[PDB]
């Protein structure tokens, strides 16, 4: 199993401290080195360091000497990672990885704990229509969409016609605006002929703010 179960996602503000846990199955806990690697959104994999499960001694990688602390709870077979004075650049997914000495490999990886550092306050999005070309009504396939902008934090879910419409639908990954607010669009390609007969409503839901909006397009 080598099972590695990490703690839930974390939403933090700059300067705060976070403590992520990684529970491993005993009867093998002291048989691996407990490493930690960070993966920033769409970035490579960066080894942060590891801690000896037999002695409790941490070894930090040069890039993580200062605000990072590796700890263990040998009783609960649990390993912890703490980051204090959190920065936006700490935003990433942290993996707790068990490693074997002989092979010197990263054998089992945890699911990864996502940490998001931001000063933004919870905010529901504004939903604007992306109207199908009007000055070009009957031309085969129509455009159509919804722009769900300025919300925080992730995620947002968008369906069309309460889920009856899925083909042609393209909901793009959110983008972090310079304002620190996310924005995204969900589009759908329909037949121009259906415009006027077939009504289109995008269903946008943002749970963090308990915001739900339906927008006819």
């Amino acid at each position: 199993q080598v099972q590695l179960l990490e703690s839930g996602p974390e939403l933090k503000k700059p300067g705060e401290t976070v403590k992520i846990s990684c529970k491993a199955s005993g009867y093998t806990f002291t048989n691996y080195g407990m490493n930690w690697v960070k993966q920033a959104p769409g970035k490579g994999l960066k080894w942060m360091g590891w801690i000896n499960t037999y002695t409790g001694e941490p070894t930090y990688a040069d890039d993580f000497k200062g605000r990072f602390a590796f700890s263990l709870e040998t009783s609960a077979s649990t390993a912890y990672l703490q980051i204090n004075n959190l920065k936006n650049e700490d935003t990433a997914t942290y993996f707790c990885v068990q490693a074997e000495r002989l092979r010197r490999t990263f054998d089992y990886w945890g699911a990864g704990t996502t940490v998001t550092v931001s000063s933004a306050s919870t905010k529901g999005p504004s939903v604007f229509p992306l109207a199908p070309s009007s000055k070009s009504t009957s031309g085969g396939t129509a455009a159509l969409g919804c722009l769900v902008k300025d919300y925080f934090p992730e995620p947002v879910t968008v369906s069309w016609n309460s889920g009856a419409l899925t083909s042609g639908v393209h909901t793009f990954p959110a983008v972090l605006q310079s304002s620190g607010l996310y924005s995204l669009s969900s589009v759908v390609t329909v037949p121009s002929s259906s415009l006027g007969t077939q009504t289109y409503i995008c269903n946008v839901n943002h749970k963090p703010s308990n915001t739900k909006v339906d927008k006819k397009v």
Binding site: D107, P129, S183, S185
Partner: protein, 217 residues
Amino acid sequence: ELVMTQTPLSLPVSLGDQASISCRSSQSLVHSNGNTYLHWYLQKPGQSPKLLIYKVSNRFSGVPDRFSGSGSGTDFTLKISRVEAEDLGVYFCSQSTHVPPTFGGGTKLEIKRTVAAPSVFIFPPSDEQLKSGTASVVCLLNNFYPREAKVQWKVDNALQSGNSQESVTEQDSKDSTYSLSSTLTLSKADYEKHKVYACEVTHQGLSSPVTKSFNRG
């Protein structure tokens, strides 16, 4: 620090075909003890990485024999005979021979298909949005292939730069294409300060760059 450069950043492949991913290290990964600690991992969207090959050619427990590895000092290769759908994801090479364990940059295995030019749609900001001081203009590039595309914005023929953000979907499961949205953001005043708004898409599937536009605002 030792640098690992994975040659194929992205590798398009047809199912059933063979795949070959390359890894080159800055220094020899031949430890003085003899062994060469060069391993290969595959990470699928939303999942934690998974050890496939260790010490150049050793397949980790449970790994399908269609996965094999070669190489000796600073150059290594992972091969996959007959690619399967479950094999699609990002492959990382990794070294554990030198001081701090480092990872290569990743190679994305993807489905290779025929060239598809994008369907280009442009949306002006909605009255409701303008009414709030902002103006987002969205340019949609629908179901195209390969992923490479170029979307240049122009406001009254003046080429824009730095004021737009673009998002791209993951290869579609059914047709293996990609879709992309480029959003041009401007203040309402600046928006009402110009006439023609146009996005020019230039994709390998188009004969000549295509441009869609409007001009109100």
